[PDB]
Structures are given as C-alpha cells and as structure tokens.
Tab-separated table of C-alpha atoms and ligand atoms in Angstrom:
chain	number	residue	atom	x	y	z
A	1	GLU	CA	13.690	-15.856	-0.356
A	2	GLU	CA	13.929	-17.473	-3.947
A	3	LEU	CA	10.778	-16.475	-5.288
A	4	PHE	CA	12.151	-12.990	-5.502
A	5	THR	CA	14.913	-13.387	-6.562
A	6	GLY	CA	15.267	-11.823	-9.732
A	7	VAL	CA	12.610	-9.729	-11.242
A	8	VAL	CA	9.215	-10.022	-9.926
A	9	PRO	CA	6.087	-9.244	-12.308
A	10	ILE	CA	3.311	-7.573	-10.489
A	11	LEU	CA	-0.360	-6.611	-10.892
A	12	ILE	CA	-2.937	-4.755	-8.091
A	13	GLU	CA	-6.515	-4.610	-8.862
A	14	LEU	CA	-8.840	-2.039	-6.505
A	15	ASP	CA	-12.592	-2.477	-6.010
A	16	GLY	CA	-13.202	0.883	-4.492
A	17	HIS	CA	-16.542	2.611	-2.669
A	18	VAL	CA	-16.676	5.908	-0.628
A	19	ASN	CA	-19.645	7.595	0.446
A	20	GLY	CA	-22.203	5.341	-2.161
A	21	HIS	CA	-19.066	6.923	-4.857
A	22	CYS	CA	-17.702	4.085	-7.004
A	23	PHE	CA	-14.127	3.324	-8.455
A	24	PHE	CA	-12.168	0.518	-9.742
A	25	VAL	CA	-7.862	0.369	-10.361
A	26	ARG	CA	-5.588	-1.577	-11.979
A	27	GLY	CA	-1.982	-0.788	-11.597
A	28	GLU	CA	0.792	-3.696	-13.325
A	29	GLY	CA	4.695	-2.914	-12.993
A	30	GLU	CA	7.521	-4.662	-11.342
A	31	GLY	CA	9.278	-5.413	-8.384
A	32	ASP	CA	12.855	-6.947	-7.195
A	33	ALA	CA	12.975	-8.061	-3.418
A	34	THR	CA	16.975	-8.279	-3.547
A	35	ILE	CA	17.457	-4.191	-3.724
A	36	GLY	CA	13.606	-3.017	-2.039
A	37	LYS	CA	13.140	-1.535	-6.520
A	38	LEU	CA	9.608	-1.228	-6.849
A	39	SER	CA	7.578	0.195	-10.295
A	40	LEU	CA	3.876	0.983	-11.323
A	41	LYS	CA	2.254	2.532	-13.490
A	42	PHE	CA	-1.693	2.626	-12.812
A	43	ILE	CA	-5.411	3.502	-13.960
A	44	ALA	CA	-8.614	4.168	-12.818
A	45	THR	CA	-10.467	2.124	-15.475
A	46	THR	CA	-14.041	3.983	-14.204
A	47	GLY	CA	-12.945	7.780	-14.976
A	48	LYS	CA	-11.609	10.671	-12.190
A	49	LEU	CA	-10.875	8.702	-9.414
A	50	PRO	CA	-13.348	10.533	-6.458
A	51	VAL	CA	-10.571	11.256	-4.037
A	52	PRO	CA	-7.153	11.952	-5.166
A	53	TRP	CA	-4.796	8.916	-6.093
A	54	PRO	CA	-2.316	9.688	-3.073
A	55	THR	CA	-4.890	8.484	-0.628
A	56	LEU	CA	-4.837	5.333	-2.870
A	57	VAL	CA	-0.790	4.947	-2.265
A	58	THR	CA	-0.327	3.320	0.815
A	59	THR	CA	-3.498	0.762	0.082
A	60	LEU	CA	-3.043	-0.362	-3.476
A	61	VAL	CA	3.037	-5.506	-1.507
A	62	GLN	CA	5.672	-4.582	1.194
A	63	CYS	CA	6.881	-8.285	0.414
A	64	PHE	CA	8.729	-6.918	-1.873
A	65	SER	CA	10.573	-5.001	1.176
A	66	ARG	CA	14.611	-5.401	0.292
A	67	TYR	CA	15.764	-7.510	3.940
A	68	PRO	CA	19.435	-7.171	5.365
A	69	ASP	CA	20.829	-10.869	5.569
A	70	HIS	CA	20.816	-10.137	8.856
A	71	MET	CA	17.255	-9.784	9.478
A	72	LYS	CA	15.818	-13.004	6.690
A	73	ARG	CA	14.970	-14.484	9.164
A	74	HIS	CA	12.354	-11.468	10.490
A	75	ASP	CA	11.164	-11.893	7.034
A	76	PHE	CA	7.323	-12.431	6.889
A	77	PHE	CA	5.674	-11.606	4.213
A	78	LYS	CA	8.647	-14.309	2.230
A	79	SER	CA	7.390	-17.140	4.187
A	80	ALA	CA	3.557	-17.109	3.181
A	81	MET	CA	4.714	-17.759	-0.572
A	82	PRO	CA	3.484	-18.712	-2.562
A	83	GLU	CA	0.271	-19.024	-1.213
A	84	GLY	CA	-1.398	-16.242	-0.164
A	85	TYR	CA	-1.449	-13.495	2.986
A	86	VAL	CA	-4.263	-11.592	4.253
A	87	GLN	CA	-4.251	-7.956	4.619
A	88	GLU	CA	-6.158	-6.138	6.878
A	89	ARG	CA	-5.971	-2.705	7.240
A	90	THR	CA	-7.847	0.654	8.804
A	91	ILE	CA	-7.302	4.191	8.961
A	92	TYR	CA	-8.370	7.427	10.488
A	93	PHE	CA	-8.010	10.149	8.601
A	94	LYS	CA	-7.845	12.986	11.122
A	95	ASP	CA	-11.525	15.130	10.656
A	96	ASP	CA	-12.059	12.800	7.743
A	97	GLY	CA	-13.528	9.816	7.075
A	98	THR	CA	-12.022	6.703	6.976
A	99	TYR	CA	-11.075	3.200	4.985
A	100	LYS	CA	-11.294	-0.420	5.729
A	101	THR	CA	-10.090	-2.448	3.330
A	102	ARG	CA	-8.790	-6.197	3.232
A	103	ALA	CA	-6.804	-7.675	0.075
A	104	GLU	CA	-4.847	-11.323	-0.206
A	105	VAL	CA	-1.213	-11.237	-1.692
A	106	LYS	CA	-0.472	-13.800	-3.784
A	107	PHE	CA	1.211	-15.774	-6.511
A	108	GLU	CA	-0.549	-16.943	-9.471
A	109	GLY	CA	2.020	-18.434	-11.857
A	110	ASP	CA	4.792	-16.580	-12.001
A	111	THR	CA	2.948	-13.057	-11.217
A	112	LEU	CA	2.386	-11.781	-7.844
A	113	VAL	CA	-0.950	-10.494	-7.783
A	114	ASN	CA	-2.622	-8.031	-4.411
A	115	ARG	CA	-7.055	-8.468	-5.256
A	116	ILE	CA	-8.180	-5.681	-3.057
A	117	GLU	CA	-12.035	-4.493	-1.768
A	118	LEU	CA	-11.627	-0.888	-0.243
A	119	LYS	CA	-14.952	0.806	2.041
A	120	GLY	CA	-14.661	4.932	2.711
A	121	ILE	CA	-17.460	6.081	5.399
A	122	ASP	CA	-18.241	9.712	6.580
A	123	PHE	CA	-15.690	10.720	4.756
A	124	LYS	CA	-16.573	15.013	5.152
A	125	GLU	CA	-18.282	16.678	2.082
A	126	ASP	CA	-15.694	19.309	0.693
A	127	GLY	CA	-13.137	17.883	3.943
A	128	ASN	CA	-9.902	17.564	1.617
A	129	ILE	CA	-10.199	14.341	0.489
A	130	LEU	CA	-13.387	14.184	-0.923
A	131	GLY	CA	-11.975	18.264	-2.112
A	132	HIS	CA	-9.224	16.660	-3.550
A	133	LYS	CA	-7.142	19.789	-1.875
A	134	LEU	CA	-3.797	17.053	-0.885
A	135	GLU	CA	-1.005	17.787	-2.168
A	136	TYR	CA	0.611	15.240	-6.311
A	137	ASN	CA	3.685	13.883	-4.211
A	138	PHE	CA	4.476	11.553	-1.299
A	139	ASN	CA	7.012	11.729	1.934
A	140	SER	CA	8.799	8.864	4.007
A	141	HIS	CA	7.297	7.417	7.028
A	142	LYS	CA	8.270	4.556	9.035
A	143	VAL	CA	6.281	0.521	9.067
A	144	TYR	CA	7.008	-0.298	12.620
A	145	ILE	CA	5.869	-4.418	12.595
A	146	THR	CA	4.908	-6.607	15.246
A	147	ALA	CA	4.615	-10.095	15.417
A	148	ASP	CA	1.231	-11.027	15.865
A	149	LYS	CA	1.222	-15.134	17.478
A	150	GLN	CA	-2.537	-15.788	17.874
A	151	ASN	CA	-3.848	-15.475	14.822
A	152	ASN	CA	-0.152	-16.487	13.658
A	153	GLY	CA	-0.132	-12.929	11.704
A	154	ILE	CA	1.778	-9.324	12.892
A	155	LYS	CA	0.450	-5.802	13.251
A	156	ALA	CA	1.531	-2.655	12.457
A	157	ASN	CA	1.039	0.522	12.686
A	158	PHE	CA	2.266	3.660	11.237
A	159	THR	CA	0.791	7.595	9.971
A	160	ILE	CA	1.058	8.832	6.917
A	161	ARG	CA	1.560	12.506	5.785
A	162	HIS	CA	-0.483	14.062	3.172
A	163	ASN	CA	0.371	17.508	1.797
A	164	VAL	CA	-2.270	19.718	1.640
A	165	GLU	CA	-2.808	22.898	-0.859
A	166	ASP	CA	-2.693	25.391	1.045
A	167	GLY	CA	0.884	23.719	3.634
A	168	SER	CA	-0.624	22.059	6.294
A	169	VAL	CA	-0.547	17.902	6.263
A	170	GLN	CA	-3.214	15.685	6.918
A	171	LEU	CA	-2.352	12.842	9.176
A	172	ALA	CA	-3.884	8.740	7.878
A	173	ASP	CA	-3.547	6.556	10.351
A	174	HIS	CA	-3.368	3.333	9.837
A	175	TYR	CA	-3.228	0.090	11.845
A	176	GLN	CA	-2.703	-2.921	9.709
A	177	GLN	CA	-3.383	-6.462	10.169
A	178	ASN	CA	-1.881	-9.705	8.462
A	179	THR	CA	-2.563	-13.322	8.487
A	180	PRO	CA	-1.365	-16.077	6.630
A	181	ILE	CA	-3.400	-18.454	3.693
A	182	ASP	CA	7.053	-16.319	10.591
A	183	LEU	CA	7.715	-14.217	13.474
A	184	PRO	CA	9.182	-11.328	13.650
A	185	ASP	CA	10.688	-9.346	16.386
A	186	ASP	CA	9.945	-6.141	16.308
A	187	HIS	CA	12.114	-3.783	13.315
A	188	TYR	CA	10.014	-0.621	11.002
A	189	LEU	CA	10.337	-0.486	7.599
A	190	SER	CA	11.821	2.443	5.171
A	191	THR	CA	9.539	4.170	2.467
A	192	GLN	CA	10.634	6.061	0.398
A	193	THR	CA	8.347	7.210	-2.796
A	194	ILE	CA	7.873	9.250	-5.444
A	195	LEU	CA	4.732	10.175	-7.138
A	196	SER	CA	4.531	11.140	-11.117
A	197	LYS	CA	2.947	10.919	-14.360
A	198	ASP	CA	3.185	9.677	-17.945
A	199	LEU	CA	3.401	12.015	-20.743
A	200	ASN	CA	1.927	9.288	-23.109
A	201	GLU	CA	-0.756	8.268	-21.217
A	202	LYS	CA	-5.001	9.592	-21.791
A	203	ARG	CA	-6.936	8.099	-19.303
A	204	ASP	CA	-7.141	8.850	-15.651
A	205	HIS	CA	-3.599	7.692	-13.559
A	206	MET	CA	-0.582	7.294	-11.873
A	207	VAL	CA	3.330	6.475	-11.823
A	208	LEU	CA	4.621	4.773	-9.217
A	209	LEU	CA	8.382	3.967	-7.974
A	210	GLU	CA	9.426	3.154	-5.117
A	211	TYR	CA	12.357	1.988	-2.179
A	212	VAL	CA	11.707	-0.131	0.651
A	213	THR	CA	14.842	-0.857	3.683
A	214	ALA	CA	14.041	-2.809	7.043
A	215	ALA	CA	15.915	-2.394	10.026
B	1	CU	CU1	-17.596	-2.565	-6.149
C-alpha cells in the first residue's frame, strides 16, 4: 500500500526471442497507483522489432492498478512488496504462434523494476503477427483474477482483441500465474490503453498511457 502512495518510477526491460529473431526492449516512465495511471516510453534498442508493438503491450506491472478502499484487502500485487512477485504467462494467438514468458517484478531502490524473458514459437510466416498486419491501437479488456492458494499465488485469464488492418481481429489467449518471492476473492481489472508515438524520437519506439481499476 504505502509503497505506492505518491508517484513511483518504473523501469521495464524485455528480452525477446521469436522464431530465431532477436530483440531487446527498454521502457522508462512512472506510475500512480492511487489513481491507476501509467505513463511509459519504450525503445527497441535493437532496431525495428520483428513483431508489431501491440503484441508486446500486454507483456511489458499490475501492482499499479487502482484498488478502491473497499477492495484494498484483495490486492495481491501490492502485498508482495518490496520483495518481488514472479509473473508467468502463456499466450496463444489464434491460428498464429505462441508466446511463453517469465518476469520478476520488484523494487530496486525506489524504482519499481520489471525484468522479462520472452520466447515466441511456431509463428506463421506472414501471418498477422510476423506480417505486421495489426493496427497500432489497443482496446479495453477485463482481466479476471482468482486465487491459487496451493502455490501461494494468483491465476488469471483474459483474451486480447487486436485490430487487424483489413478490419478483422486477432485474438490472443492469455493464461497467467503470479507467485510471490495475500489472496483475492474473484474479481477483475478493467484496463484502458492508448498507444502513441513521440515526434522527437528517431529510434524505434512506443509511448503508452494506461488506466486500470479493479472490480
Ligand atoms: Cu536474448
């Protein structure tokens, strides 16, 4: 709780391998967990990414979600601090390839840091992902959390809707395990996101603003 009153600096570092391709992504910014606001800039320090930016958005700190006082007792992510929880995920793109990921989220000094390993496999050649055919926007989604207990963590479930350029939609099935390095009765996070760019950046990048509240 108290480690998130005020505004906290965020550092996100990603390690990506998809179909033999390679990338590293670094993001700075800050979060305000008392109103659920995130602001972040990400740079692909290894030139043009091999996947479209919005596939990585879900993957790149839920501990910045806003919990109503009446729900403060059900916030897992904050309870596991300043020590760090591990976020594990599996992501199926329908009829297109998979992401499997592991991440440690923890405080380092006064910075909340999130360090991430990613593998991406079986992704179709010139499918929507490897073919960069998704629109550069993000939609709203609900993230259904539930207790794990038998491994002192939480699980999660949601489906991301991706806008394809022609007008169809790429579905991305997420499964999630978090585990500490507290338990919540079944609720969900309501997520809202805006993908932008910075007209004074040359490098390849993404600006991201986002609001999340629990219900
Ligand atoms: Cu690597």
